[PDB]
Write a protein that binds this ligand. Structure first.
Ligand SMILES: C=CCc1ccccc1O
Ligand SMILES: [Cl-]
Ligand SMILES: [Cl-]
Length: 162
């Protein structure tokens, strides 16, 4: 298990523009296209990202390409935030996967105001952080997922991803 498989599990793979649980235009492996509700804005966006007129559709490789760039960006986003950086570096490898997941899912923005959990995670108060983390919109909107990540943080193992 690693980050890519893990994310591949929680996000799925779709080769045609689709709406995400929030109702936003996405594609591939959790690749956000636009928050706008115009499918055409979406399409333009895809075209720009892939580098060609896609007409709302892409290939596997293209998907994976975006995915790579995205995990990349996540981590970089983490390493570049003064609040995140120190927490991330305190964690072990599994738990670091969980940090990237969240980030991938909710932005460096979303994650940044989870202050209390941040602090908890830094102190290594697993069970505590895990409870705190559930008290959130993120958990309530996407419970199955949120639960896998949260377990990941809590245990330090891949069990949630069996
Ligand atoms: C609650 C946030 C956990 C966390 C720590 C470090 C970097 C990213 C991240 O999501
Ligand atoms: Cl791109
Ligand atoms: Cl879910």
């Amino acid at each position: 298990m690693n980050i890519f498989e893990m994310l591949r599990i929680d996000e799925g793979l779709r080769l045609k523009i689709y709406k995400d649980t929030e109702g936003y235009y996405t594609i591939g492996i959790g690749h956000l296209l636009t928050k706008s509700p115009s499918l055409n804005a979406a399409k333009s966006e895809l075209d720009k990202a892939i580098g060609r007129n896609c007409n709302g559709v892409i290939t596997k490789d293209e998907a994976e390409k975006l995915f790579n760039q995205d995990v990349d960006a996540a981590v970089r986003g983490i390493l570049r935030n003064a609040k995140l950086k120190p927490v991330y570096d305190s964690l072990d490898a599994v738990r670091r996967c969980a940090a990237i997941n969240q980030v991938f899912q909710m932005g460096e923005t979303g994650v940044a105001g989870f202050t209390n959990s941040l602090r908890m995670l830094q102190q290594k108060r697993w069970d505590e952080a895990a409870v705190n983390l559930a008290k959130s919109r993120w958990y309530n909107q996407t419970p199955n997922r949120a639960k896998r990540v949260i377990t990941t943080f809590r245990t330090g193992t891949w069990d949630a991803y069996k």
